[PDB]
């Protein structure tokens, strides 16, 4: 709403590199899948 314009410069200027959270998401998903498989094996 009225908060995007406050830090819009930051988001589109310098956090471009820091915006790579894909590695963390993939690692978390893989860990969760492995844990689910282990739990299902029982």
């Amino acid at each position: 709403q009225f908060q995007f314009t406050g830090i819009k410069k930051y988001f589109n200027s310098y956090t471009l590199t820091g915006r790579m959270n894909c590695v963390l998401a993939t690692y978390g998903g893989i860990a969760l899948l492995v844990l689910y498989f282990k739990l299902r094996s029982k």
Partner: protein
């Protein structure tokens, strides 16, 4: 028994980990006047004092990261100090958020270095100067040394706080048990003495966590 607080993501009918982790922000009022009350003047003086001691190394590009680092240090420091309360629940105990903190910033630095200074960023693996004729041996040393930074950076934080709380709980249990058999105030003396060190041990961890990232960023900037 002992492992009750740690494995307890804010037990309730609906999880309230978000409420617990968002609570510390309701202690930093935002300034709205030229001259303000006492409670915010100290905060801004402290922020000014801390800023000039750490971000005074980077030339121009590292000055952009100033807001992120100050926010990070204030957040971790506020989270750790609030956990000393008798029945609190420190979110920094959990490994999940520690793992979700280290990886993004480390990745940002490492592939920011390659984007602009690829020639020099590739050279940092080989130590500067002539290292005799042992080049292939140390080349594989520093590259594996690269990958261990986030793991240690998370694990030390995940470990030390739990160790401290375990010590406090065990000493409390010990001083409770010895009430029935004989009289010994040495144990409560140990507790009150250790509490000072546990109180002042958090801020050192905050400082080390921020400083290591500062050094890592400055290398590739």
């Amino acid at each position: 028994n002992l492992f009750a607080s740690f494995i307890a993501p804010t037990m309730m009918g609906l999880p309230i980990v978000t409420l617990i982790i968002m609570f510390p922000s309701l202690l930093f009022p935002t300034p709205k006047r030229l001259i303000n009350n006492r409670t915010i003047s100290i905060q801004q003086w402290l922020i000014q004092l801390t800023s000039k001691q750490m971000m005074a190394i980077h030339n121009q590009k590292g000055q952009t990261w100033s807001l992120m680092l100050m926010s990070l240090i204030m957040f971790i420091g506020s989270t750790n100090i609030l956990g000393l309360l008798p029945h609190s629940f420190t979110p920094t105990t959990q490994l999940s958020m520690n793992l979700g903190m280290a990886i993004p910033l480390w990745s940002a630095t490492v592939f920011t270095g390659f984007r602009y200074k690829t020639k020099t960023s590739l050279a940092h693996f080989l130590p500067q100067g002539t290292p005799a004729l042992l080049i292939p041996m140390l080349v594989i040393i520093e590259t594996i040394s690269l990958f261990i930074q986030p793991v240690a950076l998370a694990v030390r934080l995940t470990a030390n706080i739990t160790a401290g709380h375990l010590l406090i709980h065990l000493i409390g249990g010990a001083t409770l048990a010895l009430l029935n058999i004989n009289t010994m105030t040495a144990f409560i003396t140990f507790t009150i003495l250790i509490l000072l060190t546990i109180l002042e041990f958090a801020v050192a961890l905050i400082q080390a966590y921020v400083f290591t990232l500062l050094v890592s960023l400055y290398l590739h900037d």
